[PDB]
Each structure stands twice: as C-alpha cells, then as structure tokens.
Amino acid sequence: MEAAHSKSTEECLAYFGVSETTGLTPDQVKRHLEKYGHNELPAEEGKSLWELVIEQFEDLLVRILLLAACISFVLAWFEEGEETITAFVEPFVILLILIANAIVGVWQERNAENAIEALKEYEPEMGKVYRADRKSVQRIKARDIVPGDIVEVAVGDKVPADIRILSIKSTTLRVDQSILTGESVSVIKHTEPVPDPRAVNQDKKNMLFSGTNIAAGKALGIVATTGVSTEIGKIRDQMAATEQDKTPLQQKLDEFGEQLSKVISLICVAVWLINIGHFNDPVHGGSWIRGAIYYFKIAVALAVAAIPEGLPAVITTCLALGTRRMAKKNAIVRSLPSVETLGCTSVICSDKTGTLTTNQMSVCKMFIIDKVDGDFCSLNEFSITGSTYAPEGEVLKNDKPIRSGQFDGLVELATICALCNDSSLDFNETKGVYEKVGEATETALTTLVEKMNVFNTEVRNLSKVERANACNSVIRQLMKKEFTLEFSRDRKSMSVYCSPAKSSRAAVGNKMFVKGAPEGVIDRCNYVRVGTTRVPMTGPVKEKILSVIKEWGTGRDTLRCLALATRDTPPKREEMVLDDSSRFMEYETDLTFVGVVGMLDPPRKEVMGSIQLCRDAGIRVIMITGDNKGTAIAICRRIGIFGENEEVADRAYTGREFDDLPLAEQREACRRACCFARVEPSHKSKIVEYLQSYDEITAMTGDGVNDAPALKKAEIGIAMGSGTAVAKTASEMVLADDNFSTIVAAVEEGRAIYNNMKQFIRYLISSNVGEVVCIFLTAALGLPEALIPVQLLWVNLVTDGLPATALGFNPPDLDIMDRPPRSPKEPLISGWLFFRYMAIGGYVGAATVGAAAWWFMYAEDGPGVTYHQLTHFMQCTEDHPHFEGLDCEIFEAPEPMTMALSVLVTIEMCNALNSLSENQSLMRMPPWVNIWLLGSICLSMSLHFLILYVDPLPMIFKLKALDLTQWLMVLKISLPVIGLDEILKFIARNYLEG
Ligand SMILES: C/C=C(/C)C(=O)O[C@H]1C(C)=C2[C@H]([C@@H]1OC(=O)CCCCCCC)[C@@](C)(OC(C)=O)C[C@H](OC(=O)CCC)[C@@]1(O)[C@H]2OC(=O)[C@@]1(C)O
Ligand code: ALF
Ligand SMILES: [Mg+2]
C-alpha cells in the first residue's frame, strides 16, 4: 500500500481486507507472497573471480598493447639459422606485463567490503505476526512477512517492514530512527493519519520503518511495504550500479588513449603514403606475402613507443606510499584513486550530528530564581562546561567556578534531574570512554548531576567505573522512587512519585518531581522556589521566566529547554489511578517552579577553524542534516557557515521546502544555500548530484546509515571512525581520530601528491613522444630499426619507471593551501608546454636516430656507408653490383641499436632533471634537492650497464657494451638537452607567466 500514512487506520485494513483481530488467512498469505515477494533486501556481490579480470583489459591502451602482443607472437616463427637464438621473448614479455598490471589491480580492488551486506544487518531474522492459523502470536521468519500482515512490535525489537501503526498498546511508543534521520532521539508515535502525501519520514509519525528499533513501548500495526519498497530499500537501491565515477585524472588518461589511437592509426597510414617509390619498379623479390610485414613491424614499434607502459606501476606505487603517509595523519584510505580527487575538492557536503558535533547531549545553561519583589524578579543563571557524557566540567556563575552545593535551588534542581530520569551513565572499560544508557536527553541530566555535585560527595578518588553514577546514587539514597507517571502527549511532561528514605508508607513528606516542556509545566505552577522558601507564581515572575526560555530557545544558542518543578503536597499513594494517563496532568498541577535547564548537541572544538582553512583553500562547506532547521542554522553560526547575525532566509531550506521547488530552482539552491535540514537519505545524494552538474568535485562527510547514498555518490566519501559500518563501507576515506581538521591535511596531501603526479606524467609521456618520432623517422625515411619494440619496454619500466616514482617525492609548494581548487577540466599539457614538449620529443627522436646512424657514416668500427646508400638496407643480398661495401649482415647488427638506446637512456636521465619543475631553470633551482631522483637515476644507470655486461641480457635486447669511443659520443648528444629546455624555461617565465 503506497502512502498508507495519508490514509486512516480503518482505510488501511480495508485495502488488504484483513481483520486486525484475526489476521491474514493462510490463503491470503500464499497470494501476497507471490504478488509482493519476500520481505528481504536482495544481496549483491558484483565482484566475482572471473569478472574482475575481464574489466582489467577493458582499458583502451591495454587493448592496443594486447594486439601488439598478438602480433609479436605471430611474427616469431619465421627465422633463419643465425638469429634464431631468441624469438618469443618480446611477445612473452608483453603478455606477462599485461597480466601483472592487471593482476595487481584486482588484488587492490577485490578487497572491498560490500555495503549492502552491512545494511542487511539492520534486518531482523524473526518477526511477530497474527494470522488465522493460531489465536496466539506467531514468531516467524521476517522474510516470510507479506504486505497485509498484522505485526506486533515491542521494546527492544527491530522493525521488520514498513508498518502503518494500528494500535499503541503502551502509553507511548518511542522509536529510534537513526538509520534514516541520523538522530537517536526517541520519536513519539501515534495512529492518526498524515494528510500530506509528500510528507518526509520525520513527518510520518504514524509509520514504523524497517531497520529502525523500538526504544520503548508496545504497538500493533499493519504492513505497508516490504523488500525494496521500504525506506531502507530506497537506501539499498541507491547503492548499486556504477558506484564510483572515474577520477578527473583518469578522464585525462582516457582522453589520451582515445587520441593516441587516432595518431597511431594515422602515422602508420602516413608511412604508407611514403612507401610508394619502391612499388613502381617490377620486383618479385619481395611480394605481397612479405612486403606487408614491414607495416606490422612498425605498428608494434609505434605501439610500445606511444603507450606509456610502466605508468600504472608508478601511479600505484606513489598512491600506496601516499596512503601510509596519510595513515599517520589518522586518515584511512580505502580507495587509492580518491587521493588525487580530494585535492580538487571545491565543495564539502557535511553531516551535522556525529560529524560536525559530538552526538552527546550536554546541559550548558541553567537558571533558578534569585529573589522576588513585586514586579521585580531576578534569576541565577549558570553555564556548564563540557561537550561529552563524561563527568568532566564545572559550574560557572558569571564565568566563575562556583560550587553548586551552596545554592539550595541547584540542590533541588539536581535532585529532580537524578530522580525524574529513566537513564543512567556507564564507563566502557574497553573503549576507555563514558557512554550513555538510555535516552540522550536523559543521560545529559545524569552527567549534569555528576558535574554539579550538590552534596560534595568525594569522587576524585573513585574509579571511572564507579564515578559514572556516584553523585546520582547519593540522591537516590535520600528519596525512594515509588513509581513514575510516564510521559504523555497531552502533557508534554513527566513526573515521578517519591517517598523520603527510611520512612513509613502512611507518612507525610512524599514529593512529585516533574519534568517537561516549559510552556505546559510553568502554566501548571502556582508557586516559585527561592532557595528553600516558596513564593506564589505571579504575572511578572512568569513573564520573566518565559522571556529567558524564549532567548535560550531561539537565537545564537537555540537550546532544548526543560522546566523543572516539584509537587510539594502530592495526592495520596492510593488515590492515584496509574492505569489512566489522561488523569496524570491533574496529578501534575499546583506545582512549584524550581529551574530550567538548556541542552544541545555541541559542535567539535576543531570544526570552526577547519572550515576557515577550507574557506581559505577556496572550499565551501554545506550542512545536510536530518535534524530540524532551528538547530541546523544555529550550529552553522557556531562553526562559521553562517554569520553571527547573517540573514539566511534564502540560504536554508528543509526537505519539504526543497521538494516544492522546481528542478531548475533546486539545482540553483545547492549553489546558493549552505544549510539543508530535516532531509531524507535520498535528499543528500540529490544535493551532491546537483553540485556535480556544475562540474564541481564534491566530497561528503558523515557517520550514519542515511549518509551512505551521499557518501557513495560524491567523488570523495568520508566516514567518521566512531561511525556506522555502512558509512565506512560506502566511503573512500575514514577519519580515525574523528577530527574535521584531518580533512584539511588530507586535501593538502591530495594537492601535493597530484603536483608530484603532474610531473612524472609529463616525464613519461615526453619520453614516449621522443620514441614515436624515433620510430616515425626510421619507418618513413629508409633507415633500419634504430630502436626495436623490445628495448623501449625496458626503458618504460626500469629506465624511466624509477625516476618517475622518484619525482613523487618532490618538495610541495608552501602556498598549496592558499590557492583555490584546480579545475577538473584543467589539461596537463597545453599552450607553451604543448610546444615545449613537442620540441623535446623531436629532439629525442632525432638524437636517437642520429646516434644509430652515426655508427655508419661517421663511424670508427662501422663501414663507411653514406646516406645515398644507407636508406636502401633492404637491397644488399639481392643487389650487389650497386652496393657491396662490406659484410651484408650489418644493418641488423646489435651495435647501432645500442648507440641509440644509450642516448635515449641518458637523455631521460637529463629529462628527469628538467621535470623537477615546470618553469624553473636547473641553475636557479638545484637539481640535487631530490636525493631520491639522483638515486633512481644511478640505479637505472647501473641497470643500463647491467643489461650490457651480463651476457644473457643483451642476447634478448640485441645490445653491446660501448667502449670509450662510443660512450663519450652519447654524453655529447644527450647533455645538450639540458640547455635546450633551459632556454624554453627562461622564455616562458619572461614572456608569459612565471
Ligand atoms: C606520445 C606520442 C604522441 C605522438 C601522441 O600521439 O600524443 C598526442 C596526443 C594523444 C596528445 C598530445 C600528442 O600530440 C602530439 O604531440 C602531436 C603529434 C604530431 C606529430 C607528427 C608530426 C610528424 C600530447 C601528448 O602532446 C605533447 C606535445 O605533450 C599532450 C596531451 O597529453 C597529456 O597531457 C598527457 C595525458 C596522459 C594531450 O593533448 C594528448 O591528447 C589529449 O587527449 C591530451 C590532453 O592527453
Ligand atoms: F547525523 Al545526520 F543528518 F544523519 F545530521
Ligand atoms: Mg551523523
């Protein structure tokens, strides 16, 4: 039944045609079970052993790299009897690399806790229903419950399905709806219909939602919806499909892969445009069965030269080290790519209760009557320090430490708070902190009495376990609580009947201690406490009291105010009907006013300063809470979201107010307003979505189950350490210390890491640019293979793979948190830098080829072979009278290819030094700052020498250890790339922007 809250109790029974007295018939259960299904959220584990491997090769650059491997494999059979020592190594290596990068990712992604499974923990196993089978209550499986079942719930039970309340058996039905609102405050329910068909969950006070637990009371109701048709089902549904969108950096890499395929499939064709002059002459020495292989030998040569392999290993390494670095800053990272994304955060959507606050009710203000004289009435106001449930704090009279035991009014005030209280305080020995037992608004009273200590009970020597209820127990020893007149809706108040300790039952001295809403209580007061004396409640007195409650109730404070009064002469114990709540108000009349306490969920001390740091960083903070707007706006003023006296008429909306706005004005409101209160779980994710339509990298912080849809939807989901498991499993990061200042340091790292990532991304790509040009020349000019598609691999894995990771330890800027967040669409290479790295790629491509061609023309151990005959390396064993010189097997020798490799390697060792900064010369900024970069380089060099000397290594790379004559030439070609960029750096900082 949709919108059962809008219909009456009798209208819901008619919808299913079920008797409230008997229940569903076994026939009715059969039909409903087939129609609506089982009351159960569908489990979901998308990650399987096979499907996690398939998605690894879904990358475009992987597909291109894969094909080459296939091609490499095909072109390995055909080989002579002098070079057949190695043939399958290149394809084998490509395949191995492909598997390794893919395999590592799975291990760093498969290890993920399923959020839906955690959500199903809020699904009870058993349920209590009434059916036509047996007259007694049947306890069956909760999944066997169907819409129409007459379900009974009691105190401590967990609500199985979304239920329309039929009858409340107890006086009141208190319900904890923290899974939907994020507030643990008990909600008093009723059976009256809620006319508004668009009312939110906080408004549906006649409904019982699945997953929630009964705080107190017994009730009977009818099932409205089951399974995914419930409010907790809507949470489950929003936690499916594409859980996380690609990071802005991944979008840049995906943009790179797309345009890279447009180039390789054009350059190969560009070479095809060149090879025309050879097809003219009628030659049958190289038909179509051999002349087409030349295009596949350059395709795989351009593939490994274009695709920046090794980069997935460098990024993963840098991100893994960044996690451990942030781990020491109490920041647990569950998703590595979210690190880069957090640095680009411009908007932080935050939760109020438990996140911005401590989720621990604290009484901070209280006043009693000072003196009364006619129209004059002064008060004794006090302030209480402490933001936790712990008995740590003092009472302040005009910001002075004054003992509460002196004031007789405070002695009676503490007495009421101790007795008229169904809750207690407990010290968790495992966690080492004080926790509440019962109602939060009641444990606050327990904590207050402990702080006050009106009888000066020596408690500084008691253990923390015994300290919890020390001062409260002292008061209990004075007054024996006979019984309590439980809370009523017609009263908005609660009283307890107490007799003096060690006294008869027919004795005189019993008292009733009342606690409730200020309006109703004060109106039922006819007297006023002045210390130990009593004066009549007059006009001016009542008005003065109501005035202060008005101030504490609304304003910069906005406190939950409770009035405290006692019945000096209560009815006799026998003349009080306890089975009738309608008579309780008459019992709570002729009261004597004592005092008023004010309580609130206090903000954390490190929040206001943190938000300011976010504002200084160019990041705005928005509050999205399920709490009421009144406290929401107040807390916003307390932490700096709103001004102390700023007009926020059009800067704060409720859930219902937000739903009334059209889609256009809703999207706009997310950019204007900063406070959204009394919202459903779906509202939070919708606000994030709207902000993501402005291309804003938005983050989400929370701790509750109702935050899960927003935590998942946002780019960076942040969960509190002392929060729910659902919140953690649906988040990217977890604040272990529960500090909001941790986020500031996390963003600082996120910006610092990316800047270092912004360097070796350029370093590896610029290397690949020089490799493509190198292959483009030798393929379209006539020269033999200068660099084979096997050497490049080791270059883009070990030679360049090490200095790239070494650039991840570059010293970050000092003004990194004084600059607004970078644009998500900001390109890595554009403008002058696009031309700068274009010249470098052309230099490396030229330098490399020249080196291999230097071993021919101007050589020392090579045959003088000029350019007029060097390009025709194919015509040697088939054309001798026009070409002979020396040996025929010289073009495919392991000597000139090593010369090109030695230059390429040495250049990248120099290019790594140029990649230390964007527009800062090496002369100005010392190259010896990063000791790690020198190190990567040295290791690589040795490796570059290790790959030469150790004979079983140049066997597969076709290399040769250069002598003094050949090496020295390398330094004379690679080194002037330093001065090349150096000028380019000077121009960009003297003609553009430094
Ligand atoms: C590595 C091999 C090169 C040849 C290549 O294909 O990359 C291009 C291409 C894909 C882009 C270009 C390359 O374009 C060229 O260099 C033009 C080649 C013409 C030569 C022919 C003349 C005879 C990048 C490399 O140019 C240089 C000059 O820096 C910069 C940048 O790339 C980045 O910022 C790195 C992203 C990982 C991209 O414009 C990028 O495309 C866009 O999506 C970006 C944002 O990616
Ligand atoms: F703690 Al909330 F909305 F879940 F403020
Ligand atoms: Mg919360």
Side-chain angles (χ1 to χ4, degrees):
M1 184 178 181
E2 195 70 22
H5 66 269
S6 58
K7 300 303 178 180
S8 66
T9 300
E10 308 177 0
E11 282 177 320
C12 293
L13 290 178
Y15 187 87
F16 294 90
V18 53
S19 178
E20 181 186 357
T21 79
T22 65
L24 289 180
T25 69
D27 180 86
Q28 284 177 319
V29 180
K30 177 183 178 60
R31 182 180 295 101
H32 289 356
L33 188 56
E34 297 175 359
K35 180 178 182 180
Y36 306 108
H38 296 75
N39 185 24
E40 184 179 14
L41 266 52
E44 184 187 32
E45 41 272 356
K47 293 189 179 61
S48 65
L49 186 63
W50 174 264
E51 295 177 357
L52 279 176
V53 187
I54 306 300
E55 192 177 358
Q56 291 290 341
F57 300 92
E58 194 179 2
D59 179 88
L60 181 57
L61 292 185
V62 170
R63 296 196 175 134
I64 296 188
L65 198 63
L66 181 72
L67 198 47
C70 295
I71 297 185
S72 295
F73 199 84
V74 175
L75 300 180
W77 297 352
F78 310 96
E79 197 69 24
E80 298 182 358
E82 60 180 0
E83 299 179 3
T84 179
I85 47 179
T86 52
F88 295 130
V89 183
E90 63 185 342
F92 162 95
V93 184
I94 317 175
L95 227 40
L96 177 63
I97 311 147
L98 187 41
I99 296 195
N101 287 358
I103 303 301
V104 176
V106 173
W107 183 77
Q108 300 181 4
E109 187 175 6
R110 179 257 181 179
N111 187 88
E113 300 171 335
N114 187 267
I116 297 91
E117 299 294 333
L119 181 69
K120 296 187 62 178
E121 290 187 355
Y122 295 88
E123 288 184 326
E125 178 181 350
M126 303 299 296
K128 300 180 294 182
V129 298
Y130 287 93
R131 297 182 177 178
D133 296 31
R134 299 185 300 180
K135 187 63 178 182
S136 60
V137 46
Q138 307 178 200
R139 300 172 183 264
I140 65 178
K141 300 297 182 179
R143 66 175 302 271
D144 296 325
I145 303 182
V146 298
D149 275 326
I150 306 299
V151 173
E152 170 183 293
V153 296
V155 46
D157 290 334
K158 184 179 301 178
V159 189
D162 284 18
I163 300 174
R164 176 63 164 87
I165 302 179
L166 296 175
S167 176
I168 307 178
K169 304 307 175 182
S170 61
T171 302
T172 52
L173 183 72
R174 302 181 182 89
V175 180
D176 173 32
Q177 299 178 155
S178 56
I179 67 164
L180 300 185
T181 71
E183 302 292 342
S184 60
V185 49
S186 289
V187 178
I188 284 80
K189 298 295 182 176
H190 58 80
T191 62
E192 302 296 332
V194 182
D196 198 335
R198 300 171 55 183
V200 301
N201 298 336
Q202 293 83 331
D203 299 334
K204 300 177 182 179
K205 300 179 183 181
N206 60 1
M207 296 297 304
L208 292 185
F209 308 96
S210 182
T212 59
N213 55 89
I214 305 299
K218 180 180 179 181
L220 187 66
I222 181 180
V223 182
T225 54
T226 57
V228 292
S229 300
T230 62
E231 282 297 328
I232 191 180
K234 298 181 181 179
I235 300 184
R236 188 267 168 190
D237 288 22
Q238 290 200 12
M239 296 188 300
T242 59
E243 299 181 356
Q244 182 66 23
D245 188 89
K246 293 184 178 181
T247 73
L249 181 59
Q250 287 178 356
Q251 294 185 359
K252 295 299 180 179
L253 298 182
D254 277 278
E255 187 183 24
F256 176 79
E258 292 179 0
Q259 295 295 100
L260 190 59
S261 180
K262 303 298 181 179
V263 169
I264 300 302
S265 61
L266 184 59
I267 292 302
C268 294
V269 184
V271 177
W272 186 90
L273 308 182
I274 302 300
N275 302 330
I276 304 183
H278 179 259
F279 188 77
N280 297 329
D281 57 272
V283 46
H284 57 271
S287 179
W288 297 78
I289 64 179
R290 186 180 180 181
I293 317 181
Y294 183 82
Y295 291 94
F296 286 87
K297 292 182 178 180
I298 62 179
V300 299
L302 282 169
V304 303
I307 301 177
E309 56 270 335
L311 180 58
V314 177
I315 297 179
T316 306
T317 305
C318 177
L319 266 53
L321 297 176
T323 301
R324 264 182 183 174
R325 184 172 299 106
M326 288 180 294
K328 299 185 61 179
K329 287 295 185 61
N330 298 326
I332 307 301
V333 177
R334 306 180 71 260
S335 182
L336 301 182
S338 62
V339 177
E340 174 269 346
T341 317
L342 185 59
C344 308
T345 302
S346 61
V347 184
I348 300 181
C349 294
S350 178
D351 182 26
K352 187 187 106 302
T353 306
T355 302
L356 290 179
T357 61
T358 61
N359 194 22
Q360 293 177 308
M361 278 291 175
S362 297
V363 173
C364 55
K365 285 185 178 178
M366 63 175 183
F367 70 87
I368 59 177
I369 310 292
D370 185 25
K371 64 172 297 180
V372 180
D373 186 87
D375 294 24
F376 175 76
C377 175
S378 59
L379 310 179
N380 279 329
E381 306 181 15
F382 296 91
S383 61
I384 318 297
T385 55
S387 58
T388 57
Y389 283 141
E392 301 171 354
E394 292 181 349
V395 182
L396 309 177
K397 175 63 178 181
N398 297 324
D399 299 89
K400 291 183 179 60
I402 305 300
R403 302 199 303 180
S404 304
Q406 304 296 325
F407 304 90
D408 291 317
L410 294 183
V411 177
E412 188 176 9
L413 181 137
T415 304
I416 304 173
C417 297
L419 297 176
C420 192
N421 182 13
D422 289 325
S423 298
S424 60
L425 187 61
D426 178 76
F427 179 81
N428 195 320
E429 297 180 274
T430 301
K431 295 185 178 181
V433 289
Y434 293 82
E435 296 175 337
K436 68 164 182 57
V437 185
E439 273 294 284
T441 56
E442 276 192 334
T443 310
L445 266 58
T446 303
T447 306
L448 177 61
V449 175
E450 293 299 325
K451 294 178 176 179
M452 294 179 62
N453 200 342
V454 293
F455 293 108
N456 306 280
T457 304
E458 197 61 32
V459 294
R460 73 168 303 274
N461 293 321
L462 300 179
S463 66
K464 288 191 174 183
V465 184
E466 190 180 349
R467 177 58 218 269
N469 294 266
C471 293
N472 280 262
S473 291
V474 180
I475 304 185
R476 300 193 197 100
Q477 296 295 301
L478 302 184
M479 301 295 295
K480 173 184 178 180
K481 182 195 295 189
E482 301 284 350
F483 57 90
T484 90
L485 303 182
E486 65 279 357
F487 179 86
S488 178
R489 302 182 70 258
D490 55 90
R491 279 181 300 159
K492 294 183 179 300
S493 65
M494 174 216 303
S495 56
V496 297
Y497 194 91
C498 302
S499 62
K502 307 169 181 180
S503 63
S504 300
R505 306 188 83 260
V508 178
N510 304 342
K511 302 293 177 181
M512 286 181 55
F513 305 101
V514 199
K515 174 191 66 176
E519 184 173 350
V521 168
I522 294 177
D523 272 89
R524 296 196 298 266
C525 290
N526 296 334
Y527 308 103
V528 156
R529 297 294 214 192
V530 186
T532 54
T533 66
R534 183 217 289 185
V535 294
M537 173 76 71
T538 65
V541 172
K542 183 177 184 177
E543 295 180 3
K544 215 287 167 59
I545 301 180
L546 290 176
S547 62
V548 179
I549 303 179
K550 184 70 64 179
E551 297 179 3
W552 291 6
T554 58
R556 294 166 53 182
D557 38 26
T558 311
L559 305 179
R560 190 94 59 88
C561 296
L562 277 68
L564 311 178
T566 78
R567 173 81 99 97
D568 298 325
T569 311
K572 299 184 182 303
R573 197 192 332 271
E574 302 79 16
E575 63 183 7
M576 294 183 60
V577 179
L578 307 186
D579 59 270
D580 192 18
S581 64
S582 64
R583 296 175 57 92
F584 287 172
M585 194 181 65
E586 186 61 32
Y587 298 153
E588 299 180 1
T589 194
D590 198 36
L591 307 182
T592 307
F593 181 82
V594 175
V596 170
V597 292
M599 69 185 67
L600 187 59
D601 182 20
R604 302 171 177 265
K605 301 181 180 181
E606 65 282 355
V607 167
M608 161 173 282
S610 303
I611 298 181
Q612 179 59 220
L613 294 183
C614 296
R615 178 178 289 101
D616 293 328
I619 311 176
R620 63 188 296 247
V621 177
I622 306 179
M623 171 182 294
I624 321 181
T625 178
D627 206 340
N628 304 330
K629 183 154 66 178
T631 67
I633 298 185
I635 295 301
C636 285
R637 302 179 187 268
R638 268 187 168 94
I639 62 186
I641 294 187
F642 290 150
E644 210 72 19
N645 304 277
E646 177 183 349
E647 183 69 22
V648 290
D650 60 328
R651 301 196 62 182
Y653 299 92
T654 70
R656 259 291 300 175
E657 288 175 346
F658 184 74
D659 292 328
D660 288 331
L661 298 178
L663 277 70
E665 296 186 7
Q666 288 184 13
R667 179 175 179 265
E668 169 71 11
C670 294
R671 195 174 64 177
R672 192 201 323 115
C674 292
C675 181
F676 298 85
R678 181 177 207 83
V679 304
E680 296 180 339
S682 60
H683 281 142
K684 301 193 175 183
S685 54
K686 187 182 302 178
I687 297 178
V688 176
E689 179 178 354
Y690 275 147
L691 291 176
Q692 291 171 346
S693 62
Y694 293 95
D695 292 28
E696 280 185 323
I697 303 301
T698 60
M700 180 62 182
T701 68
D703 61 325
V705 184
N706 53 326
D707 293 326
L711 287 168
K712 178 157 290 189
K713 187 53 179 295
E715 278 77 16
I716 311 97
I718 307 177
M720 305 289 288
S722 58
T724 62
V726 176
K728 297 181 180 179
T729 55
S731 300
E732 282 70 87
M733 294 181 180
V734 173
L735 305 177
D737 54 9
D738 289 329
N739 287 328
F740 203 87
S741 58
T742 304
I743 306 178
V744 179
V747 173
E748 183 181 15
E749 189 71 31
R751 296 185 179 184
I753 289 300
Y754 176 81
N755 292 336
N756 297 17
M757 293 189 67
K758 204 177 187 181
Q759 294 303 137
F760 63 76
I761 279 292
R762 297 175 178 169
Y763 167 73
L764 293 183
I765 290 302
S766 181
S767 179
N768 279 91
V769 177
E771 292 181 4
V772 173
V773 177
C774 176
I775 304 301
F776 172 77
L777 291 181
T778 60
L781 195 56
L783 283 79
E785 301 178 2
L787 292 167
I788 61 179
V790 191
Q791 298 169 6
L792 308 167
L793 297 183
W794 193 83
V795 169
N796 306 331
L797 280 170
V798 181
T799 301
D800 301 342
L802 297 174
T805 312
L807 290 181
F809 290 158
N810 298 335
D813 299 332
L814 307 180
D815 57 330
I816 190 55
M817 292 301 294
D818 301 273
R819 183 176 183 178
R822 72 173 193 90
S823 178
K825 307 303 178 181
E826 171 179 327
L828 293 168
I829 304 294
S830 61
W832 172 262
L833 191 54
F834 188 86
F835 164 76
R836 169 179 161 181
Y837 283 158
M838 184 73 263
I840 296 192
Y843 176 77
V844 177
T848 299
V849 177
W854 179 84
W855 193 77
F856 292 94
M857 297 188 299
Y858 307 92
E860 297 290 340
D861 301 270
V865 176
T866 59
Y867 173 80
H868 188 265
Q869 53 179 359
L870 181 57
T871 59
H872 304 76
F873 71 100
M874 178 176 54
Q875 301 181 4
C876 181
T877 60
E878 60 181 4
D879 185 85
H880 294 269
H882 181 59
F883 180 83
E884 203 139 334
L886 164 90
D887 204 330
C888 298
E889 192 179 356
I890 303 297
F891 309 107
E892 294 184 355
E895 281 73 18
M897 296 181 300
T898 319
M899 185 63 183
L901 187 64
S902 299
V903 171
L904 175 63
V905 167
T906 314
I907 285 181
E908 301 303 324
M909 298 306 103
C910 297
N911 185 265
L913 301 179
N914 300 121
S915 298
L916 278 175
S917 181
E918 182 179 0
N919 296 322
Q920 295 291 340
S921 296
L922 277 66
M923 179 180 300
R924 186 59 181 180
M925 183 177 300
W928 57 84
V929 167
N930 286 269
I931 53 183
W932 296 87
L933 179 62
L934 307 198
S936 171
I937 294 169
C938 291
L939 177 63
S940 296
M941 283 323 321
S942 295
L943 295 174
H944 178 58
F945 290 152
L946 187 68
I947 205 180
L948 297 177
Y949 281 87
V950 182
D951 184 87
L953 294 186
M955 181 183 60
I956 61 181
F957 284 98
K958 298 185 297 180
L959 299 178
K960 175 184 177 181
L962 306 184
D963 300 331
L964 292 176
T965 309
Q966 308 184 28
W967 183 260
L968 283 179
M969 188 71 260
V970 173
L971 317 199
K972 297 172 59 179
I973 303 301
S974 300
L975 267 300
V977 84
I978 293 296
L980 173 60
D981 195 359
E982 203 83 343
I983 302 301
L984 299 179
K985 283 183 174 182
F986 186 83
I987 300 301
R989 64 187 178 183
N990 289 279
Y991 297 95
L992 297 175
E993 180 180 358

